[PDB]
Amino acid sequence: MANVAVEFLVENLMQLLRDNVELISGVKEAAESLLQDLNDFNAFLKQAAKCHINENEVLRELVKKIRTVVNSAEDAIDKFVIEAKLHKDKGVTRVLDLPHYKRVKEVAGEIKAIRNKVREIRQTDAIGLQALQDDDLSARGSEERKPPVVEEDDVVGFDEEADIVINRLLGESNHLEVVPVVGMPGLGKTTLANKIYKHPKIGYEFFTRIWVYVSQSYRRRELFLNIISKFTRNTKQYHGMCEEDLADEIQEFLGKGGKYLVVLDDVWSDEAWERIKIAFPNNNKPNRVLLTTRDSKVAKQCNPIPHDLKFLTEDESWILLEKKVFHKDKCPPELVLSGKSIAKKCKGLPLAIVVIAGALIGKGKTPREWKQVDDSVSEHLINRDHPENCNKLVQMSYDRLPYDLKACFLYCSAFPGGFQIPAWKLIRLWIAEGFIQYKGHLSLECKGEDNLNDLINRNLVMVMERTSDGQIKTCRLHDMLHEFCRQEAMKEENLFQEIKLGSEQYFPGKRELSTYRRLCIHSSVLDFFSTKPSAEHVRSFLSFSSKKIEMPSADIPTIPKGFPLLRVLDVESINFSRFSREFYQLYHLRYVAFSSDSIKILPKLMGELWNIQTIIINTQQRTLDIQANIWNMERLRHLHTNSSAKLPVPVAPKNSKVTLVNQSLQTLSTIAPESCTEEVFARTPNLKKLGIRGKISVLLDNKSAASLKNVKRLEYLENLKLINDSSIQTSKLRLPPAYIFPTKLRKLTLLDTWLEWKDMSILGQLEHLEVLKMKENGFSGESWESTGGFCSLLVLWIERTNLVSWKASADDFPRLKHLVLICCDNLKEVPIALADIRSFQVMMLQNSTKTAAISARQIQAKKDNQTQQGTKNIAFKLSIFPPDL
Amino acid sequence: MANVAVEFLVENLMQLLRDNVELISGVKEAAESLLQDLNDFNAFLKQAAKCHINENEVLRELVKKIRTVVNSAEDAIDKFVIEAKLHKDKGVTRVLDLPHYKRVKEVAGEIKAIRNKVREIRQTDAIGLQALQDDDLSARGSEERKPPVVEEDDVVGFDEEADIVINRLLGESNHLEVVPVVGMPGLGKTTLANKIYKHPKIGYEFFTRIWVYVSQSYRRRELFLNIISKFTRNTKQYHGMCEEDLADEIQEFLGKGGKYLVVLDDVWSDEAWERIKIAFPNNNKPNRVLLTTRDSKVAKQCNPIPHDLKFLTEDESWILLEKKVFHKDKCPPELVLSGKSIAKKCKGLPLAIVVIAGALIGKGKTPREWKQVDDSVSEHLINRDHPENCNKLVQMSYDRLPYDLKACFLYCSAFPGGFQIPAWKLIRLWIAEGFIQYKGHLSLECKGEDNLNDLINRNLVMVMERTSDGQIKTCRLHDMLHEFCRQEAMKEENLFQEIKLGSEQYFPGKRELSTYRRLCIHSSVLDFFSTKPSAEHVRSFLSFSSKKIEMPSADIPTIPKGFPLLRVLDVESINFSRFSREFYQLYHLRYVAFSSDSIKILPKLMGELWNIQTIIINTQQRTLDIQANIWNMERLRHLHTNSSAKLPVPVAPKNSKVTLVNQSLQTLSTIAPESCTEEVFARTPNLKKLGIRGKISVLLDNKSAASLKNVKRLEYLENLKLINDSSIQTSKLRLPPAYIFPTKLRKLTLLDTWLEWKDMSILGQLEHLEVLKMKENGFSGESWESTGGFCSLLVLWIERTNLVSWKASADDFPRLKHLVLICCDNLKEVPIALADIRSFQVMMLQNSTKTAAISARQIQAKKDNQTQQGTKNIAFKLSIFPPDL
Ligand SMILES: O=P(O)(O)O[C@H]1[C@H](OP(=O)(O)O)[C@@H](OP(=O)(O)O)[C@H](OP(=O)(O)O)[C@@H](OP(=O)(O)O)[C@H]1OP(=O)(O)O
Ligand SMILES: O=P(O)(O)O[C@H]1[C@H](OP(=O)(O)O)[C@H](OP(=O)(O)O)[C@@H](OP(=O)(O)O)[C@@H](OP(=O)(O)O)[C@H]1OP(=O)(O)O
Ligand SMILES: Nc1ncnc2c1ncn2[C@@H]1O[C@H](COP(=O)(O)OP(=O)(O)O)[C@@H](O)[C@H]1O
Ligand SMILES: Nc1ncnc2c1ncn2[C@@H]1O[C@H](COP(=O)(O)OP(=O)(O)O)[C@@H](O)[C@H]1O
């Protein structure tokens, strides 16, 4: 949406005027005129949005070029910014900088010419929104949206198919056979396969089960390395060996554990099936492979009897439609006729039903809205076979999105098709792109989380993973939606442009690269960098892939020189040996995601960049000394990393009344314990997620800075993580008193701490703690005797525990909702008083005593006894990794 | 041919028995058996070759499988060799190393099985040996072949096309037009193009001429950088510059220099011409482009008036065939009819005639052979349009070719098609693969050179550049011959397999890679080495790329582990930052060519590989401190490098009477002057080409080490090179007396020497020195006055000198034949006395004073009159750089 570009430019310009007079001292007047012009123009574009846009070209034509002048203004302004910073770099003390001052005055001439263009647009019409103001549509206030829990998990109308498939199971023993699930895109084949994968009979029958995603772009070795990843924790040996050895190892592993089931998802071509088939052992067992394909021919090749997936019936369609649109609540009678007509117009395609349900929830719940929806659906679903029917339906749903949401939804298409998107990264990207601007009380990250939740509610986005707490973790757009938004962003809005090379094609030339605004590459990135391409007007660079790629020491400086006006640099997949000096002249940089293996120091020159918000660094080093003055990059909102970052010692300038208090800071992922000192904590009042990695005993020790005591200061802290790297137990560690911890702390993690279970009472005292995950022998002992305290705790996560005996009362864990038991060989059995608690529903048993599993059956049995009685306690489901237990 | 494999196995086994008994001590008996049976198999194969194996099916089978046992015996014996050396590495001092001695003895059980399998078959060979020997053919001795000096430079019946083309040019001035050239493959279009590109009228009209090859698989940036390299020295900067901006610079450079002609060679597809035409400015000047293509459609697109090439007429065919077959000599009358009939049967295709001439040369000069050839060609040329007729003709020529030479043509195909093969590299490959076996007294390299000259004489291999002295420098296979050689070597004899991948295709799997003998990769290789491949029966790896590809720091150890039985490792085009341990365990290594940029120290462990002949290192460093005890690698025959290497100080073992005197050694290309010491020269008695790089002063200084004196010891030296890197003229340098230089010295080169033109008398005193090349101010001064001495000098080459006055008499340069005056911008004129030298044939004057060029034309006119005066004077040719002179 044009408003997004105009607003971003406006915000940048006001920030530039406020923060730095010198940068804009030269052209302050034209800049301010541009700022006022942009404000009024944004008002104009809003008025235009009020009237039908997709219908009238003339309103669109008036809109057209407002952006181009804005884009030119944005460009010219950025060019000026970099030029003036380069002037500073020269450090010329001359009053009249005879060299390059004329050039910067000519840049000021470009700025003035852009001012004249915007003035010309205002001249063509004093506003141009007279006709627009004449007609106003869709007048209404803004209401709230609700965070979604897992809803309508049950699949409407596909249970019979689940039973049919589960009947194909054990059709013939001692054999490997493939079951082809054939259906049109979005018909629910993947959902049906997922259902079959979670079915209790399937889980009980086959000891080992695997989920495998065979995209259209699968990569055999990557596919095999994943399958090997599940079975064995350490994969160092298998990395170095050939794909055929990988297949042989997979075959051995599958043969080890009795019988097995594997689901190959979205097998596009028969050849891929053939190539992948070699991994699975034909070990004379009743093993089965579930295959989800959209092509009939490939399904027939896999097996002459393909299980055709059937359409939903009208009753099923209406049930699904009302469930989706109204969630738990049922449909009001007055809307039932309209909803039934809409569902009957879906012909039984679940995706159509879900998309129209999203459209309905977006529009409202009035009879007129439903009548309009029914009319539009009838209009846009005359035909049946054409896949463009779903595109038209998606268009219908999309047009009703809020403008800011539309920009995020499109910016989702940019991530590779079929690639699961980290939610946190996606949020931080939007904040960098300026899509999301501070509104109301919610902080930007919170607003972005709300945006993603709304999109999930609309059914636009799918959730692939959910954290323990239930929050979304990884999102992937559906393929049809991904294609629709890809086309939209690439053509209609030119939000981003993607270079994907066919074999015969070649990289677009410099002239074409000049037009693109944002760049996303998923083909070979290295071949692109070999071309030495140059674009002055690419501000966003994105490359997402599974395989990590090195940067040849000759191609390193390609990026900063190729693009000098970068904001978003997402090169996480690209491994960098070092950084050229040209990187330290990307002043318009907001986001930096890069991976390195040798980088040990973050250099000082990184400090000079000022607009950066996020920083993500993957390095194999066990230490990452940060020498850049983070205390000066005021906009800094995150410093992510996985090493033991050692923050620089804060030092207030001897002759400054500026306090280096970065009020914007939110995260410090894995800073080193030595840095957990009073000053750094004092400098980050609003910190909201801390984590440490290194010698935790330094925190706990008195001699060092009493770091765990200093942690009391972060009044707002809500996520703590202690990681102990020392593989040597030099002594025992005793936590501090419960009052030292930040009051709001809601999520805590302990890894390799080896704490004494007598301290668990300390964590019990915490009032708000809601997610306690201790892993890698976080707490070491043999007898745990819970002493209550965890009033608010909702989930408990134990892994690699050497605990022999645990004793609990129903009062000890009142709110607990889910329990995870991993590598708990020592523990004999799980206290029954935990079975008493109603909240506790789901628990996972892995690598634990079979007696513990029988007592877990007893726990589920008490919950099932409540079920049989009808007494109301939250329903209970059991997961045990080894079925034998 | 099978004899080649058997002979190589026999030689390697004999060498293993002689040198190292411990490696063979385990299976000495099976080794000696194998040796005997292999000798008998070699004799049997020779006898079968005497007969026509193809004629009889029984024979085909009898020859078949003798090779398989030999290949099987090689694999087992090599595996034992490496395993036993690994045992030595273990250093298990136990009398019975029962653990893992039974593994190496498992390999030994394979060995013994093989020995028994050979004794079988030897028995099967015993039967029928008499039946084979009952028949024989082609009973004749071997005669001498002679060196291939340039001949038949003129092109038969093609001056009509040349004049037509030169007429087509200059049609429309102030405009840029491209003239198509069309015709079937091998029709001579490139020959005509090169003829035109050298015609004096062309060399007079257009100042700027450029010749460019456009393969089937060209790469635009590569050729643009090369085109720029013509006008300016360096290309490394533009390596950081985009293809389109490269094109802009090319256009500027080319437009600055008056008019221009450019020849694009072998254009295949329209898209390529479209993409490439950009660099040429249509700057409103009379400029032309000459493109050669085999397709009519591309030619028509480039211009509606393509120039069809004409077939050679029967008289033209006969004259060409006679010139090729009989060289300068005329045809004997008795063979005239057969020759005319054969030429008539070639239908005027120059390539067919050329290959037929090669075949006739191979057969001999008897009427029976000519009648047989006439019959055969009549047989194989009933059709005209079928391209396979030329394939049949080359097969006919090939059949008569000695198997040593036959092993080439097929190994020649390994180099990427269209690649310019460095002759020296090709010969050292030959030697390393073992295709050239000791037969007589000529040094191996000499035998290779004669093989290559014979290949050229039969016309199978076309030469591209000759060194100054005329010895070949760079050759290639013709396209038709290349496809014929590639198909044949891959299918019939399985000499090697190319891995190059097509679209929607995959790298062959480990099963396929188990049946390969040699790997040639000419396309993406980093992709191949990211597959983590594996093969045990691959002995050779060839990668003749275009760009220098780095090796990712994580993907380095793929080659040593992918192939542990390597001999030839030609990875010159792959930049390695370091070497893995698994590389040092490679023991079957003869040839090792590789590049680098940061490698400063050759590792010590690299000196353990006992079996290496060649070594090539294109390290960018200025210094390459060698620490491998080259003195210990008894088969070392070359140590090529480009930086200034520092050979380890020799130390005769304290307790061994074994002298570390290498007598195979031939070259120490670029050792450091510090390492031109007495001992380093005692240890290389048969050294035959030495070069130095560094501060030449330390040599010419007698206080440090009388090093240019020590050069006196190398009684056989025949190529010296003194390269000075010190850019600071600290002092003047004085050559030692002429009696110090080795007597046979036939080539000398001096760069940055800054010697006083007075010393030139010393170089005059040398009696055999035949080619003197002084580049980048070899001698410093302004007045040179010849005093004689250069009795045998044949080529004089001066580049980048400040010589002003040159004075000489005709008696100072009696034998001179070639004179090159490059970048002599201060010289005034050249002594006209040179006009009197009979041998003086060719002189080239580049970028020099116009007065010198006037004197050059005076010399040219004088020699014209001399030849006109009835004297049997050889033809003279004058090359002057700028057309105005
Ligand atoms: O053909 P090359 O193998 O490349 O070597 C010859 C020359 O030695 P010779 O004249 O005795 O053959 C130099 O020796 P090397 O460097 O190969 O050891 C070489 O020097 P540079 O490659 O460093 O330049 C030179 O190179 P170039 O062809 O570029 O002049 C080249 O000269 P010629 O081929 O004319 O003899
Ligand atoms: O398994 P991981 O991918 O490594 O993620 C877990 C954790 O997952 P859960 O929230 O589901 O327990 C969080 O991952 P995200 O959802 O943020 O992607 C995050 O920890 P927080 O919840 O505290 O943010 C992360 O971070 P870290 O590696 O710093 O602990 C932590 O990793 P671990 O599994 O290694 O603990
Ligand atoms: N019976 C069903 N109930 C709910 N959603 C369904 C059903 N069948 C298909 N779907 C669709 O599947 C989505 C989630 O599964 P998904 O992986 O997208 O499968 P598919 O795209 O094959 O339908 C739902 O949001 C909905 O759009
Ligand atoms: N009169 C001639 N005209 C053309 N080619 C000739 C002639 N005499 C000999 N030849 C040889 O025949 C071949 C002509 O085809 P060639 O130039 O190899 O193929 P292409 O033109 O496709 O590159 C060359 O080897 C050339 O030297």
GROMACS .gro file of N, CA, C and O in nm, chain B residues 261-291:
model
  124
 1146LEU      N    1   3.795  -0.331  -3.603
 1146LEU     CA    2   3.740  -0.456  -3.652
 1146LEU      C    3   3.752  -0.559  -3.541
 1146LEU      O    4   3.853  -0.560  -3.470
 1147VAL      N    5   3.651  -0.642  -3.525
 1147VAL     CA    6   3.654  -0.749  -3.426
 1147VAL      C    7   3.598  -0.875  -3.489
 1147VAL      O    8   3.498  -0.871  -3.561
 1148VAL      N    9   3.663  -0.988  -3.462
 1148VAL     CA   10   3.622  -1.117  -3.514
 1148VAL      C   11   3.570  -1.200  -3.397
 1148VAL      O   12   3.644  -1.228  -3.302
 1149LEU      N   13   3.443  -1.238  -3.405
 1149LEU     CA   14   3.383  -1.329  -3.309
 1149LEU      C   15   3.382  -1.468  -3.370
 1149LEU      O   16   3.324  -1.488  -3.477
 1150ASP      N   17   3.448  -1.562  -3.304
 1150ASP     CA   18   3.474  -1.693  -3.362
 1150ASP      C   19   3.371  -1.793  -3.314
 1150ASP      O   20   3.347  -1.807  -3.193
 1151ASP      N   21   3.310  -1.864  -3.409
 1151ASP     CA   22   3.223  -1.977  -3.380
 1151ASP      C   23   3.106  -1.937  -3.290
 1151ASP      O   24   3.089  -1.987  -3.179
 1152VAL      N   25   3.025  -1.845  -3.341
 1152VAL     CA   26   2.902  -1.807  -3.272
 1152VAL      C   27   2.797  -1.915  -3.297
 1152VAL      O   28   2.770  -1.951  -3.412
 1153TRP      N   29   2.738  -1.966  -3.189
 1153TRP     CA   30   2.642  -2.075  -3.198
 1153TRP      C   31   2.498  -2.027  -3.200
 1153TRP      O   32   2.424  -2.059  -3.294
 1154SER      N   33   2.457  -1.952  -3.099
 1154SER     CA   34   2.317  -1.917  -3.080
 1154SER      C   35   2.296  -1.767  -3.096
 1154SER      O   36   2.385  -1.687  -3.067
 1155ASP      N   37   2.176  -1.732  -3.141
 1155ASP     CA   38   2.142  -1.591  -3.159
 1155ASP      C   39   2.153  -1.515  -3.028
 1155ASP      O   40   2.206  -1.403  -3.025
 1156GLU      N   41   2.104  -1.574  -2.919
 1156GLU     CA   42   2.104  -1.505  -2.791
 1156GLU      C   43   2.244  -1.459  -2.753
 1156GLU      O   44   2.260  -1.352  -2.693
 1157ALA      N   45   2.346  -1.539  -2.785
 1157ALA     CA   46   2.482  -1.501  -2.748
 1157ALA      C   47   2.524  -1.374  -2.819
 1157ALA      O   48   2.580  -1.282  -2.758
 1158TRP      N   49   2.499  -1.366  -2.950
 1158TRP     CA   50   2.531  -1.245  -3.024
 1158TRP      C   51   2.453  -1.126  -2.970
 1158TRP      O   52   2.509  -1.017  -2.953
 1159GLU      N   53   2.325  -1.147  -2.942
 1159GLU     CA   54   2.244  -1.040  -2.885
 1159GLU      C   55   2.306  -0.988  -2.756
 1159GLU      O   56   2.321  -0.867  -2.737
 1160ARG      N   57   2.342  -1.079  -2.666
 1160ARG     CA   58   2.396  -1.039  -2.537
 1160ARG      C   59   2.529  -0.967  -2.554
 1160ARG      O   60   2.557  -0.871  -2.482
 1161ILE      N   61   2.611  -1.012  -2.648
 1161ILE     CA   62   2.748  -0.963  -2.653
 1161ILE      C   63   2.762  -0.834  -2.733
 1161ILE      O   64   2.854  -0.756  -2.707
 1162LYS      N   65   2.672  -0.807  -2.828
 1162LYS     CA   66   2.690  -0.690  -2.915
 1162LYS      C   67   2.697  -0.560  -2.837
 1162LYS      O   68   2.735  -0.457  -2.893
 1163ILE      N   69   2.662  -0.561  -2.708
 1163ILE     CA   70   2.649  -0.437  -2.633
 1163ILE      C   71   2.782  -0.364  -2.627
 1163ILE      O   72   2.788  -0.241  -2.641
 1164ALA      N   73   2.892  -0.437  -2.605
 1164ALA     CA   74   3.019  -0.372  -2.578
 1164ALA      C   75   3.069  -0.288  -2.695
 1164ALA      O   76   3.154  -0.201  -2.675
 1165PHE      N   77   3.017  -0.310  -2.816
 1165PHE     CA   78   3.069  -0.243  -2.935
 1165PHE      C   79   2.996  -0.112  -2.957
 1165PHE      O   80   2.875  -0.113  -2.984
 1166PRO      N   81   3.064   0.003  -2.950
 1166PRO     CA   82   2.996   0.132  -2.970
 1166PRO      C   83   2.965   0.155  -3.117
 1166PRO      O   84   3.053   0.145  -3.203
 1167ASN      N   85   2.839   0.185  -3.147
 1167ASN     CA   86   2.799   0.232  -3.279
 1167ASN      C   87   2.818   0.384  -3.286
 1167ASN      O   88   2.725   0.461  -3.307
 1168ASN      N   89   2.944   0.425  -3.269
 1168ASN     CA   90   2.978   0.565  -3.250
 1168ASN      C   91   2.988   0.642  -3.380
 1168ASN      O   92   3.058   0.743  -3.385
 1169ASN      N   93   2.921   0.596  -3.485
 1169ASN     CA   94   2.919   0.666  -3.613
 1169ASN      C   95   3.058   0.668  -3.677
 1169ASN      O   96   3.112   0.773  -3.712
 1170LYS      N   97   3.116   0.549  -3.690
 1170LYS     CA   98   3.246   0.529  -3.754
 1170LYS      C   99   3.236   0.408  -3.844
 1170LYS      O  100   3.145   0.325  -3.829
 1171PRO      N  101   3.328   0.394  -3.940
 1171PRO     CA  102   3.329   0.275  -4.027
 1171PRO      C  103   3.395   0.155  -3.960
 1171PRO      O  104   3.515   0.128  -3.976
 1172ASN      N  105   3.316   0.082  -3.882
 1172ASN     CA  106   3.364  -0.031  -3.804
 1172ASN      C  107   3.284  -0.155  -3.839
 1172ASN      O  108   3.166  -0.148  -3.873
 1173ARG      N  109   3.350  -0.271  -3.828
 1173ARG     CA  110   3.293  -0.396  -3.875
 1173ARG      C  111   3.317  -0.505  -3.772
 1173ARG      O  112   3.412  -0.499  -3.694
 1174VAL      N  113   3.228  -0.604  -3.772
 1174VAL     CA  114   3.244  -0.725  -3.693
 1174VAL      C  115   3.233  -0.844  -3.787
 1174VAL      O  116   3.145  -0.847  -3.873
 1175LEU      N  117   3.322  -0.941  -3.770
 1175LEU     CA  118   3.325  -1.061  -3.852
 1175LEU      C  119   3.294  -1.180  -3.763
 1175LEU      O  120   3.378  -1.220  -3.682
 1176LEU      N  121   3.175  -1.236  -3.778
 1176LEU     CA  122   3.133  -1.351  -3.699
 1176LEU      C  123   3.132  -1.475  -3.786
 1176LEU      O  124   3.088  -1.470  -3.902
   0.00000   0.00000   0.00000
